[PDB]
Design a protein around this nucleic acid. Sequence first.
RNA 1: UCGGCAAAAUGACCCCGUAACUUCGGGAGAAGGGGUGCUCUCCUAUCUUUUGAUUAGGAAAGCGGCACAUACCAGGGGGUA
RNA 2: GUAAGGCGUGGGAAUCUGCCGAACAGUUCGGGCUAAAUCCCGAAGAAAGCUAGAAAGCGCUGUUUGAUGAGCCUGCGUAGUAUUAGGUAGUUGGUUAGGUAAAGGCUGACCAAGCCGAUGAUGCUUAGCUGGUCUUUUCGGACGAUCAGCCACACCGGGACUGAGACACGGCCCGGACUCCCACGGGGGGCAGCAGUGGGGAAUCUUGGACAAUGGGCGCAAGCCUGAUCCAGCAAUAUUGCGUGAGUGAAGAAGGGCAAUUCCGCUCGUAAAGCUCUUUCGUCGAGUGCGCGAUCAUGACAUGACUCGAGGAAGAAGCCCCGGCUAACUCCGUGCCAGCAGCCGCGGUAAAACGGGGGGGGCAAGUGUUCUUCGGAAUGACUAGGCGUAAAGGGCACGUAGGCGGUUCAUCGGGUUGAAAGUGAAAGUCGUCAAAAAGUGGCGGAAUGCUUUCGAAACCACUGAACUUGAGUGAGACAGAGGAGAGUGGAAUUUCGUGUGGAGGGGUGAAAUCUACGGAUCUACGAAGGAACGCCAAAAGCGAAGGCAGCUCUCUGGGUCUCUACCGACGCUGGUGUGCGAAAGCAUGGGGAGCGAACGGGAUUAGAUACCCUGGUAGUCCAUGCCGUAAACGAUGAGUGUUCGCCCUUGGUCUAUUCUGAUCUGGGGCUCAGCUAACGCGUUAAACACUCCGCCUGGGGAGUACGGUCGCAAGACCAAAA
RNA 3: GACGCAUACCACGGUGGGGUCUUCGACUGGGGUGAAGUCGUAACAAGGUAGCCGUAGGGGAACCUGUGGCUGGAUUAUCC
Lengths: 124, 128
Amino acid sequence: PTFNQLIRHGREEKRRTDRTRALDKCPQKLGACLRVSTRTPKKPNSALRKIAKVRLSNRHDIFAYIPGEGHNLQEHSQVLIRGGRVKDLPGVKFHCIRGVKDLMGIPGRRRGRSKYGAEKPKSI
Amino acid sequence: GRRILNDALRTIVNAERRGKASVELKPISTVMSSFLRIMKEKGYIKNFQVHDPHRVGRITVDLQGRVNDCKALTYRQDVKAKEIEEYTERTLPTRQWGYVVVTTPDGILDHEEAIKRNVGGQVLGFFY
RNA sequence: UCGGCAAAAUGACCCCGUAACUUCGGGAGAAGGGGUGCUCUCCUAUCUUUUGAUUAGGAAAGCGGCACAUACCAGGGGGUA
RNA sequence: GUAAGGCGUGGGAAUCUGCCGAACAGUUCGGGCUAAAUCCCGAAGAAAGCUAGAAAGCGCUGUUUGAUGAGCCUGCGUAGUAUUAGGUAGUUGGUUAGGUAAAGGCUGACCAAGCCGAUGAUGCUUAGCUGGUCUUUUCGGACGAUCAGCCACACCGGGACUGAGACACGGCCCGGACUCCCACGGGGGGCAGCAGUGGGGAAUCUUGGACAAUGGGCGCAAGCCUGAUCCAGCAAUAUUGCGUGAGUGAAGAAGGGCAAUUCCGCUCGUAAAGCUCUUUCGUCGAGUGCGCGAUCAUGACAUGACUCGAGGAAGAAGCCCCGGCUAACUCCGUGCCAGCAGCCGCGGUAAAACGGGGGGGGCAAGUGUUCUUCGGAAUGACUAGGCGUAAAGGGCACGUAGGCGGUUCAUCGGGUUGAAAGUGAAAGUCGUCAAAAAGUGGCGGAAUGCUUUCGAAACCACUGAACUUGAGUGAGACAGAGGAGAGUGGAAUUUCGUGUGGAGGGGUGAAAUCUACGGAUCUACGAAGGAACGCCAAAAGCGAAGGCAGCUCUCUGGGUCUCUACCGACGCUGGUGUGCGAAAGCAUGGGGAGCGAACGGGAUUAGAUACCCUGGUAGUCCAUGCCGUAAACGAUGAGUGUUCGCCCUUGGUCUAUUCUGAUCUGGGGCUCAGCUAACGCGUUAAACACUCCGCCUGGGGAGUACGGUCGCAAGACCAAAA
RNA sequence: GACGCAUACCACGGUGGGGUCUUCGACUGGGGUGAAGUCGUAACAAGGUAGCCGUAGGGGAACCUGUGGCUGGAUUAUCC
Ligand SMILES: [K+]
Ligand SMILES: [K+]
Ligand SMILES: [K+]
Ligand SMILES: [K+]
Ligand SMILES: [K+]
Ligand SMILES: [K+]
Ligand SMILES: [K+]
Ligand SMILES: [K+]
Ligand SMILES: [K+]
Ligand SMILES: [K+]
Ligand SMILES: [K+]
Ligand SMILES: [K+]
Ligand SMILES: [K+]
Ligand SMILES: [Mg+2]
Ligand SMILES: [Mg+2]
Ligand SMILES: [Mg+2]
Ligand SMILES: [Mg+2]
Ligand SMILES: [Mg+2]
Ligand SMILES: [Mg+2]
Ligand SMILES: [Mg+2]
Ligand SMILES: [Mg+2]
Ligand SMILES: [Mg+2]
Ligand SMILES: [Mg+2]
Ligand SMILES: [Mg+2]
Ligand SMILES: [Mg+2]
Ligand SMILES: [Mg+2]
Ligand SMILES: [Mg+2]
Ligand SMILES: [Mg+2]
Ligand SMILES: [Mg+2]
Ligand SMILES: [Mg+2]
Ligand SMILES: [Mg+2]
Ligand SMILES: [Mg+2]
Ligand SMILES: [Mg+2]
Ligand SMILES: [Mg+2]
Ligand SMILES: [Mg+2]
Ligand SMILES: [Mg+2]
Ligand SMILES: [Mg+2]
Ligand SMILES: [Mg+2]
Ligand SMILES: [Mg+2]
Ligand SMILES: [Mg+2]
Ligand SMILES: [Mg+2]
Ligand SMILES: [Mg+2]
Ligand SMILES: [Mg+2]
Ligand SMILES: [Mg+2]
Ligand SMILES: [Mg+2]
Ligand SMILES: [Mg+2]
Ligand SMILES: [Mg+2]
Ligand SMILES: [Mg+2]
Ligand SMILES: [Mg+2]
Ligand SMILES: [Mg+2]
Ligand SMILES: [Mg+2]
Ligand SMILES: [Mg+2]
Ligand SMILES: [Mg+2]
Ligand SMILES: [Mg+2]
Ligand SMILES: [Mg+2]
Ligand SMILES: [Mg+2]
Ligand SMILES: [Mg+2]
Ligand SMILES: [Mg+2]
Ligand SMILES: [Mg+2]
Ligand SMILES: [Mg+2]
Ligand SMILES: [Mg+2]
Ligand SMILES: [Mg+2]
Ligand SMILES: [Mg+2]
Ligand SMILES: [Mg+2]
Ligand SMILES: [Mg+2]
Ligand SMILES: [Mg+2]
């Protein structure tokens, strides 16, 4: 535009939608599991991904992924929820944090194990 | 008179890139001839003649093949004498060669002379 | 009670305020509110045929009562098929 | 809470100001509170006395002042939203009274109808503002938490009193909600002070010590207060800090991993252990303390620090990663499962990508993950981008505001510019030194600004006199499907009539419906009617665009050329607005040949709501209104200046030297350059520059939803989000 | 100084409209995505009837048809 046009009507910003609107600009949110289930991935991937329907403390209903192999979650279990989507599964935009609240860590995990709540094995 | 000054400087640039020997400028002004005197002093043009400056003025310019670009500002730009050097740093594309022409209360001067005389004013334009 | 049938209520003038919708005419007195008697004193006018005091309207200060359209007369209103 | 009664910055006049500094004058007499007074009242002139314990020392009062604060006003600067266009009625102004310390519609009365608003009032939403913090080659963006300056508030609303100062966080009165006692009549309370507790939350600390220092209140002091502060406690929350050793060491030990099972087979690995040295940090034991913070004196910190001694490598290394982006590879297990994933992608029997072993890489008392900000992102482009074919030129104009726009001479001093003065708080950023060893300070610079004074006079603005090159007129020549009105012409189609004539015509890929012996098609002449105007004729012409075609006449808009004519910058663009605007469609009345949505029939086909055939309504035409949209396209906004040529052509003029040149004017083809992602554009640019407007910011959702305006409707315009 | 249950102003409270938002709602739409189902074959080649724009009508459904416009279609040694 001309300089006079920019004086009259400036420049707006780019419009981009929020990724995790339900976290409400918090790093984590506590929740309680409503339904623990599995979901199949979008093609070309094929598995049975363990997810959980979680109602958050601000009364938002989200789908969160349960990472790792095996979990102890049931209905009405407390889970701490962090951001981060799962690319196989549309509509799943969050993760459950292992080793906090009801979701236990994974013993026997040895590598990358602070992302799975696993302690350091004591040397004997 | 900013529009006719830019018209004349662009006419000079365009016939310069055609490899011509001379141009005719019309309409002219005293600001235009002072800009051309500064250009002649720095060697960018060879010579210029003013014809009938008080009735219907036209200017003949002699060309040498030495100027890349002459521009007149089309907007008001104030500069202080302590501000001239950083403006010239930001305005010349090479930041080394070329001159900024300023209208001062001491007259129309190039930027180095205006720094030396410690006088500010309005930027007319530049050439390099 | 078949059903507010009948009754009760509203009701006048002046001022404020008036919605949905509309064929832009309406709806509309929508709805909802306030004042109203008398005495004195000013102001205005009554196009005063007894013009230096009489009527109408308005301000302002008072007076009495439960009550000032005191009797008589005199719309109930709104929403929706 | 507050979007301007606030804040930042600079000013002003119509005010007050306890304590503090400095002058001058006074400090007299009665009464009242059970008793008195520096308490209250009265008289003069305003007051108030205490102390010979504080006797010329305090205190008070009045008048002049300095200083410091406070109140009031004001210029400039300081959000989003028009899918919010009108708002105001003490409102805007005047007069006169009142009120205030003080100007003032601050408000009573009277008078006028003003005031604010497209340069965005009012409505709605959000928000304390600043110094500054983080990021960033300058600009910007986000933030306004700590700390300091200003403002606002103190459970929620409303008030005033006292006072120099408050409409007062830990004061008073009233109303409200909540709450604690109550002997039941009634009372009491307000942590958004410091600690602390419930609650909410992913998440944020001790119910600590001392007034030693600094600051503050009271007191003549001595002192007394001070959860201001100072200092300890908790928390890897942050910080370019320090440490976890320094050497040596081959039985290359054991053990682990890999291996034609290569060179001690390769590697963990000189790694460990062992041996020698040093003990920072932390640990333990002592000793001086006018070491130091503090001095006349006073030390919470301080169970510290400092100094000395004991001791023994002793007490101190993880986290992420190793397919590519990206530094770092092998074995086993699994077998599109389990799982991984920032992106691209991995896993379906030899997976460097999943999980474990072994090895390795990066950082390191941290390191990853999530959230949030800036950068990379020139990905909202001022710096520094675009719109022919990728997102994006408004269908086209006219014009309001606004923006932008020729020459000379003279004047002036508002902008501009030079210097001086004032201001720009401190802290922070930058420079430098010293200090310190994860810590501090001084002096500068910067603070790009505003006010005042005095210079300058080129530019912008303003004033005056002039100029003619841009715009506009006139005179004289022209061209034109420019527009509107009124007349008129012929060909052809259809229908009808009359002669002659007799068998089909029409139509298809092939057929059939249809039409024809009531005589068609065909042939001659005639009649009626509507619509469109062949040839000319087209890369021609005209119009702003949409558009405009037979001919005549009337009325009329614009354009071109020439001039030793006038006039004198009157110009360009154009938000909001206004107008014009194919076709289809709508309303009323006409008209209706041909064509033809819908529809009927005949066919094709698996079906055929089509394509083909045959009938054919609205419509297509006229008059008057509405609508306001098109691939309304050159998919190219309007304008101005400049840039090598060649070939044509429209309409003029001049020169001609018998056939052409020159110069304007539009319209085309080609091209040197230059430009372009490429195709291509190229004096009618998409070239070299500029002015002004419109528009774009990944795809889909979507030109959809909602709302407003407009329309008789059909719909149109502005136009999202999940 | 009272003081008057004297006027004014005024909070709370009552009441009627506006402006601007918001909870819930029988039912009825739209959009996005998907393995594979049903019906057809609309577009891309002249895509089998060139395609597309505005507008109008018609149809299970893509779509078809008129009308004006566009080329962002292919094919095809100008002739008084
Ligand atoms: K995972
Ligand atoms: K301040
Ligand atoms: K309050
Ligand atoms: K103290
Ligand atoms: K951490
Ligand atoms: K050690
Ligand atoms: K114009
Ligand atoms: K033309
Ligand atoms: K014209
Ligand atoms: K012509
Ligand atoms: K070409
Ligand atoms: K041009
Ligand atoms: K169509
Ligand atoms: Mg009943
Ligand atoms: Mg009745
Ligand atoms: Mg009755
Ligand atoms: Mg009367
Ligand atoms: Mg606004
Ligand atoms: Mg707030
Ligand atoms: Mg701010
Ligand atoms: Mg509270
Ligand atoms: Mg006091
Ligand atoms: Mg007082
Ligand atoms: Mg308190
Ligand atoms: Mg507290
Ligand atoms: Mg909690
Ligand atoms: Mg002190
Ligand atoms: Mg003292
Ligand atoms: Mg304390
Ligand atoms: Mg460190
Ligand atoms: Mg030590
Ligand atoms: Mg010790
Ligand atoms: Mg000491
Ligand atoms: Mg300590
Ligand atoms: Mg690599
Ligand atoms: Mg394998
Ligand atoms: Mg990897
Ligand atoms: Mg792995
Ligand atoms: Mg940027
Ligand atoms: Mg950058
Ligand atoms: Mg730019
Ligand atoms: Mg771009
Ligand atoms: Mg452009
Ligand atoms: Mg256009
Ligand atoms: Mg367009
Ligand atoms: Mg001059
Ligand atoms: Mg000046
Ligand atoms: Mg400073
Ligand atoms: Mg410092
Ligand atoms: Mg320093
Ligand atoms: Mg039409
Ligand atoms: Mg008709
Ligand atoms: Mg049929
Ligand atoms: Mg047909
Ligand atoms: Mg027909
Ligand atoms: Mg359009
Ligand atoms: Mg067209
Ligand atoms: Mg000619
Ligand atoms: Mg030409
Ligand atoms: Mg381009
Ligand atoms: Mg335009
Ligand atoms: Mg539309
Ligand atoms: Mg609508
Ligand atoms: Mg088709
Ligand atoms: Mg097809
Ligand atoms: Mg096609």
